[PDB]
Curated annotation (Swiss-Prot), chains A, B:
It is found in: Cytoplasm; Cell membrane. It is an enzyme of class 4 (lyase). Changing N61H: Reduced proton transfer. The gene is CA2. The record marks Y6, N61, N66 as: Fine-tunes the proton-transfer properties of H-64. This is Carbonic anhydrase 2. PANTHER family: CARBONIC ANHYDRASE, CARBONIC ANHYDRASE 2.
Amino acid sequence: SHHWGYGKHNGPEHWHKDFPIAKGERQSPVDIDTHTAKYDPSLKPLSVSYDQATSLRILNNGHAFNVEFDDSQDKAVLKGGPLDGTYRLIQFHFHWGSLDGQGSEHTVDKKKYAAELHLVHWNTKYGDFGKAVQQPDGLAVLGIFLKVGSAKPGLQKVVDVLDSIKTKGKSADFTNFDPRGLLPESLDYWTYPGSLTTPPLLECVTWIVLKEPISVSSEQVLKFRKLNFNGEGEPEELMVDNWRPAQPLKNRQIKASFK
Amino acid sequence: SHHWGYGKHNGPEHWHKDFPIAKGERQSPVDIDTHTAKYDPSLKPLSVSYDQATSLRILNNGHAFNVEFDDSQDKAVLKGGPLDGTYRLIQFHFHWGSLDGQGSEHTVDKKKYAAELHLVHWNTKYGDFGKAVQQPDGLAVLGIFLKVGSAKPGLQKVVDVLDSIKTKGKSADFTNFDPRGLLPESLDYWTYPGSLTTPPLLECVTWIVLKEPISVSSEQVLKFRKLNFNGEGEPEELMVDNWRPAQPLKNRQIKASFK
Ligand SMILES: [Zn+2]
Ligand SMILES: [Zn+2]
């Protein structure tokens, strides 16, 4: 009965009908205006501890594809930065475009990237993800821009398995993936309080959005575009433009860890 | 696997473990201290429109039994009183004791009744119940005390079907029930902002609690106590004392429609 998507009739412009928080005061994504996003010197260094990250599976959920991690222990955690205590990595996914010029959720001085990576973490204060998503400080999503340029070696293992999860509901074993291979060199970041960028759009996310994009090749991102929103047997609907546009900032302050 | 109940180990004293809102600022039930619950002359008469009410079924959910109504239209609505706009009746149920001296959720100057009836309504503003339960003004529950006295004729149709829904999961067709037959003659009420009295304890409820109890016979309430929490084939666990005790009022005001 309930569906949502990125199409003409079920798209971001309509999500409010089932999810009234879509018009809330803390919605993501947003545009980062660098002229207004002020350097905050009290922001601490971001601590990314992914050395023991344990990936398990990869799956097409009908909106994006997710790589899932074992979050039963502190094997892959985000700490410091703007955060209070310890946030475990549960999954990552991407949003991308039908063309190289668009695909990202966050924009920077109105500039769109080809795609955006989201590493999703939950506050261990709340015992599990389910309890976390319902708290204002429940999640931390580390957001990373993807520009088209040189191939990203650390992304190839993802790209290579995509032909096995073409359609909604498909999944595959996906062990030993190294998420450090998707990070840029600089951990300089912007931060602001926001939300999930898909329904149910819960306002439980501390956003950390990195200054430095990673590069991916034209052919790498092109592989993302050969996925399907639809299930097996249904009409083909290519999985492209699965991004929500910039939402009004309202009275939120985007703080910068760098000058 | 998540469970809750009224037992030693899964009871109201433990609900906070899975539902941290249990310790929130707007939890129900409460004690109504009549010395402090002040008459508010600006409170309007309560408007109960149940003339077209359409009951459908009755069911044992493993925590109480519910009589469900067709809420697809304005056939049975609560309006006026402390409420803004129109609230449709979805179901009623009761909480009761193992003895005649206890069973109610709300108390009045610490006085417990043998049971408490809850007519559950949702704000039509939000399209359905599912969306309603997540809003601060989503629900209105009309609460009515039951004291042991004379038989309530309008309750007998409920009592007579209970042998057919003994155990969790059991349901039966239940048409043409008249919910007006469960009302006392006075619609004088106390009101306060609160919550669901069972998990998930959401703080979405405008409580309207009637001053005048209805009477039920000793044998009528005794029939409620022959129901089972458990499913068919499971150990017998009599459905008694399915009430949450009074929670701290915090900085809430209980207003009275009467002097
Ligand atoms: Zn995302
Ligand atoms: Zn109830």
